[PDB]
């Protein structure tokens, strides 16, 4: 990790370092274009659909796919079991 804010930029993720610069960033990490790994939906991501924090990350694939948490799946869960069933 020499030089700052561009110019030679390596990848803590795959354990390679980049010269052609495929470097992204989050918080103060740096990644490849194709290493960005949401550990929230558990998915390999896309380029510009991401969200960093601290030194981990979840995805704008996620602030997308779950743009609005609440619930969905037909049934509720609290129906008519009534304790004992």
Least distance from Zn ion to the Cβ atom of residue 22, Å: 8
Count of residues making up the chain: 85
List Cα–Cα distances, 39 to 5, 9, 22, 56, 62, in angstroms. 26, 23, 21, 8, 11
Closer to Zn ion by CB, 67 or 74: give it.
67
User: Which residue in 26, 33, 35, 52 binds Zn ion (CB under 5 A)?
Assistant: 35
24, 50, 57, 59: residue in contact with Zn ion (rule CB under 5 A): 59
Closer by beta carbon to Zn ion, 6 or else 77? 6
């Amino acid at each position: 990790m020499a030089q700052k804010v561009g110019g030679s930029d390596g990848c803590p993720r795959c354990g390679q370092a980049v010269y052609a610069a495929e470097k992204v960033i989050g918080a103060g990490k740096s990644w490849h274009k194709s290493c960005f790994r949401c550990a929230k939906c558990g998915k390999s991501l896309e380029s510009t659909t991401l969200a960093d924090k601290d030194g981990e990350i979840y995805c704008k694939g996620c602030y997308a796919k779950n743009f609005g948490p609440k619930g969905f799946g037909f049934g509720q869960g609290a129906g008519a079991l009534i304790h004992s069933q």
